[PDB]
């Protein structure tokens, strides 16, 4: 799974250990080994949410399965909670797009997961 | 909706008020309330379009509905127009990927839209 | 087609010519003229893969068709090879997501490709 967060929060406000925390919580949430979890945080962005430049985030979670109605509600509580606690972003200024990827459509290690 | 523009145009060439203009025009075009429109502009990128490093852009528009053949043509005229007027990017050096998101696959405010 | 690479490798480690090499090889691989290939490299990112911050990459390849099981295996061999040779990224620390776009969902030149 791959989790990406783009935010207008500055780099200095991203705590040491945040990528490691996301890796662990995402492994737990998705049930996938942490060795397969990729995380990417992009601070200092030029962004607005509802016209406003108050802290906000646009995110994505891509996974081969483990994506669905109940699972995605659960992920959103988890991830919005982490963004609120660690980056001081209000959950109502976060979008997370969930993508259920086909294994044939994910490249890794010179081949695909199919 | 969420609109992301990645461009090799430098930051200093992005005019003041650009994120607000995007937010407004996208609310009008999509019919969505402006409080739900998110916008993200990423200048100074290392990019090429058709092998050339002349001004170009790669963009995305994600929306829960309001995506389709005619609607996307209309969006592209609006958005290419704005990139041309405000960033001086030729419309023929812009790609815009459109995504119709299922409500269950968009997280916001600790839950999803489903 | 549009190919995006996000990496923690620093900007100074991206060799001269790399966007052109990508453009050329992708044109050959996809069969699309190079005039229609866009490439975007994003270095110096805050990323972890499998819990560690050795060189890694998260990439995407969007194309109108020319996406499928065998094709995508072939693209991954090519692209992981290039990231290994030019950026010194181990192919087991690369994910590439492949998107088969509908022509009506790709904006260009004030309209769509439909």
UniProtKB/Swiss-Prot annotation, chains A, B, C:
Entry-linked InterPro entries: Macrophage_inhib_fac, Macrophage_inhib_fac_CS, Tautomerase/MIF_sf
Reaction catalysed by this enzyme: 3-phenylpyruvate = enol-phenylpyruvate; L-dopachrome = 5,6-dihydroxyindole-2-carboxylate
Residues the record marks as active site: 1 (proton acceptor)
Entry protein name: Macrophage migration inhibitory factor
The entry's keywords: Acetylation, Cytokine, Cytoplasm, Immunity, Inflammatory response, Innate immunity, Isomerase, Secreted
One GO cellular component term noted in the UniProt record for this chain: plasma membrane
Taxonomic lineage of the native organism: Eukaryota, Metazoa, Chordata, Craniata, Vertebrata
Keyword Membrane recorded: no
């Amino acid at each position: 799974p791959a989790f990406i967060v783009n935010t207008n929060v500055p780099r200095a406000s991203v705590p040491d250990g945040f990528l490691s925390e996301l890796t662990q919580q995402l492994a737990q949430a998705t049930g996938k080994p942490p060795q397969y979890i990729a995380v990417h945080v992009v601070p200092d962005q030029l962004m607005a949410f509802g016209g406003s430049s108050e802290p906000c985030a646009l995110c994505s979670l891509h996974s081969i399965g483990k994506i669905g109605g109940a699972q995605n509600r659960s992920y959103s509580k988890l991830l919005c909670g982490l963004l609120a606690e660690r980056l001081r972003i209000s959950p109502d200024r976060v979008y997370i797009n969930y993508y259920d990827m086909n294994a044939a459509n994910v490249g890794w290690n010179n081949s695909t997961f199919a």
